[model samples]
Target: LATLIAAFGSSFQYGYNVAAINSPSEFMKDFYAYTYYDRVGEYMNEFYLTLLWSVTVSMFPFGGFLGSLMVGPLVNNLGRKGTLLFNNIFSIVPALLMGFSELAKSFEMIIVARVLVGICAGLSSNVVPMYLGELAPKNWRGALGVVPQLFITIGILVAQIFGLRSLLANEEGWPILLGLTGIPAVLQLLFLPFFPESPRYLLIQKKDEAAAKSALRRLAEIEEILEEDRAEKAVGFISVLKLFKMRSLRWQVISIIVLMAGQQLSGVNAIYYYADQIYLSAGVNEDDVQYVTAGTGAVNVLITVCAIFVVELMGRRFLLLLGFSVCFTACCVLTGALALQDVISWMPYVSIACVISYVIGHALGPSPIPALLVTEIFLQSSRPAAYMVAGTVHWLSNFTVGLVFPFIQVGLGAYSFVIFAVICLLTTVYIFLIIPE
Candidate 1:
């Protein structure tokens, strides 16, 4: 009850709302401009309008970073369930702001809403992981912990399905698109109270043995759970270590760092953060860009599901190395199709292949393996340490690309994939030494 719903209900919104808003970037841009005119009592200039739209798209991640920084206080102060329930304030308010931004006559309101929802997402990412880390029976610990990322992929896929212009990616539907994020928070709010609080949170954080013991009988076998909790006490962190100063974690720490930095910087966001624009650049017909962009997301979801089997069959190193090969080639192909479209009559089809191929390659390795890889390589003692280095690289890389990709696209035009191609090549070589067990 608490597990699936909370992960999907709260965390799903994070990925769903992120990708949901993405497929309609074109529709929203014009929406942004129109709202600006109503608020400012003058027409929006093309330059500032585009810039504001970029900020709107970028603000989700901008807010996500700041949101992550607050996880410590919120989780400790509020408790896991309490933190999530409280976090809905961020989602619901932002949802209302975006849902009615047009009605309220304030485009800037949507920007503020984006930042607020970002904080909501940051809270979800942290709290849900805390729920998974602390709450699950140790017997199922590793398996269930990975579930939220899969849910995020599901959210991204579903958003693509719904955000298709045939459904909503139009002038009329843009507000609905932006506002739909609040739905998950509502689900979490309604269902979570009926469920149990994490017993570990009760015993460890809350120090209420009576409450923890009462919840225990209602959960998995009490003896089994407590035994699991005792082992968890071992895996739990003793104290923080700086990224460089850690001993057993030192080298893979940097490799994990390289792993994440290269992953996001590889231009996945440009595909997503500007899905419609990339299609338009790919020579997708203007009317079809929304559908085509959504199609790319569908492929992203499909390949991610397929990656589950491929990882089992091929091993992580092989998929990553092969995925790197495919991504570099496809991105360069995409870059060429964009750069040479005027010269080559057949380039649009090439661009289609490039985009779909990029999705396939991305799903094959870079998509799932990084998260799985970190835990497998490090001892429990050092896994958190490795993750600290990895987390910094992961979010910072994501932050750079999310905020800057649109601007990078603005400058690089058809050649934007060149950046991703170069990074993919470099990361593949860096991680080749690790074959995995």
Candidate 2:
């Protein structure tokens, strides 16, 4: 439970960062333009400003990928708690920089800061799930593992609420908005010292059996009872190629890879990335876009909250199948809503419904299950290697949407979602045939 709470402090920030950055794009890009002008001492063209702003958003995934690569070495060398402790530097410094971006006279600083914080998110995403999974007992493992996802949705909801134009998404509040990401790291740093390291990490990596056992006892007491199951680091940090040779993890890899791909590339991410504009296109007034975005964000969290309970009740397979089915249908309707932009006035309202329905669908499964699946599928020895692969793929897809969606939106406009709709269908079929609950 303490571990899960710590994850709320660490991993939750990743979700907040995702939605927070998305909503403030108009203000932030404008700020970026001015900062670039100040540094370069010349005004930038709209194209160049957008080019730089794209890098600002896209750099996060690039940073996340770098952080993912650093995971094995960091965990091996520093240990999980130690690595997480040291990583606060990433979030703190970036938060300060972004919080003072206007005063600092350097838009480039915010971009660099974004990458640094992105690295923080990358580390949190991998480590939090691993740490919490080990801390949880087998009696209720499925629900415990989903804690990170629930918190992420909560975090996203919080960001959206704060990003309302009346709050931080405007010129006066943008820095404050960006600065808030660091608060969790500060809180985590404060609360975490009292908690013990994962006993499994202590035993497997540090070879401290006594410490591992003691940690497990404490964990059980605090965590409603749990384990000191030893972690076995297989292949000892080999490349993806060597690990893939085992053949047993082949299906695990395929399932998680495709599932993760569906999680990111299924248009959900792109929709969030373009949410402010999507809200605007859906007939929301420009003045109220942020608030409506908040409204949609609230739907995401409420549905996710309900699903977390439902997940424990029905099991994962049904939710995945049910979720993918809903998402596929929403995607088709969303695309058609866009295609009929001129002909149908009500399509904008339908577009909003599509977004809401899609969020409801995602909250049901693909959002939470993928992370849970990673923990269950592999033996401890192979688990770390698998996460490295999985984390890299997750960040890459995240970057793909952030980097390319603008171009896709530009080229295909409303039609881009059609492609996403098809991917949702394909992913749904794969889940039906291959992935068991």
Candidate 3:
């Protein structure tokens, strides 16, 4: 219950903010031009506007990078729920800043808010999964761990739904769209306090036996906590540098880096970053493109919800192979379809079909499984630092794609997906040949 509420409030915000920006992009860009002209008596040139827009898009992951670094100290000192509650400071402030960016006539505020919300997202992505892992019974761990990603997809879907022209993607509506992020933060603030902290955090980190007993009762777990303590000495949080030096963990570290980096580099965000434009290029009617984009979001959420049960049922290895294989095939087909669209009148539908399948590929495993695998692979002592490493790689890869993909699209034209195809292929090969099952 707590895990669900916390995820809805926190990880959901991450997904919402990520996809929400895609909807109001043109309107926001116009606002940026209007603000600049109003101040300087000249309309900003294309280069300058593009540069500013790039910053806005890339800053979220850059902020996530910074927040990833902060997880060690924040979770160590603040405990799980403490940091989650406190993390809202990042969200609420940014929501206000972005909500009023137009009134203040400051594109700078919008840029700043993107980074702040990214930080909140970064923190939640790491923490909520950790919380779920600790709270879950042993048999159900994989299912519980996948819950955060489900909320994230739900968030993305909601953002797409609300971003439609009939709703928030307009001159007066974009600010409110951006500002609404605070609602989840506020929801988490009001309700999450009633939930218990991770029994693992209380018992292992703080050595609070009584509190641990109470938390265990409230959360409905008991034997695992005692068993965990008996089997391993409490080591609290390990530092990332120390974690890197431990030779036995080399493959674990390497595998996580590959999976996390691949998750972003697989071009999932690239699809989301410009789905509207991608659909437009596929010859989707102007009126129907947004609906198609939302359709993809809905499919993403539905597929991810199934993955929650499917992860435990099929095991992570199957999904990993299945996801990367499907993505690789989709990218190859998308590349050909996009290249041949002008030559063949029916190619656009193929492109759209590839996009939907690509979403299915990602949601099935790559998007949700890596985080669960990270938790499963590492012991509690090393887990926090492991997540920090994974989060950093994830965000950095995300930042790179967000900043560079537009140029790649411009330079490669229809061949752009070829890059993602190569990445998906390599990751699949690495998973099957090298990593242990």
Highest lDDT among the candidates is held by which one?
3
Structural similarity to truth (TM-score) of each candidate:
0.89, 0.89, 0.90
Between candidates 1 and 3, which one is better according to TM-score?
3
Model 1 alpha-carbon drift over 4 Å, by segment: 1-7, 34-45, 105-107, 220-241, 342-345, 379-386, 434-437
> Residue-wise lDDT of candidate 1 within 326-432, one digit each (tens)?
98899887888898777555888788888889878877788678877887887766665565556656666776777777777788887788888889988888877
State how far residue 224 of model 1 sits from its true place (Å).
8.0
Clashing pairs in 2: 234-381
lDDT by residue (1-437, candidate 3, tens digit) is 66456554587888888888888887888888987878899989887787778788888988989887777688778888888888886578999898888788656688888898888888776677667667776666654566667788888988899988779989899889999889888878877787778777787678787887776765534745466665666557677998889998888999999999998999999877778877776558888887899999999988988888887788889889999999999999889788876756688888889999999988887887887788789978888689778888999999998888777777798888999999999999999987766
Q: For model 2, what is the error of residue 1's alpha carbon versus the real structure, in angstroms, after optimal superposition?
A: 8.6
User: Higher lDDT: candidate 1 or 3?
Assistant: 3
Residues 1-437, candidate 2: write the lDDT tens digits.
66546644676888888887777788877776666666778888867776676677788877889887877788777877778888986579988888888786545667788889888888767776666667666565556555667787778888888888887778788889888998888888887877778766776677766777777766434332223332222234445675678777788888888988888888676666678876675456788778777888889888877887887688888988888889889988877787677755667778888889999998888787887788788766677677777777788888887877776766787776777878788999998998887
lDDT (Cα atoms) of all candidates against the true structure: 0.73, 0.77, 0.83
The list of candidate 3 runs beyond 4 A from truth reads: 1-8, 136-142, 200-210, 220-247, 379-382
Predicted model with the maximum TM-score:
3
- Residue 263 Cα positional deviation in candidate 1, in Å, after optimal superposition: 1.2
Better of 1 and 2 by lDDT: 2
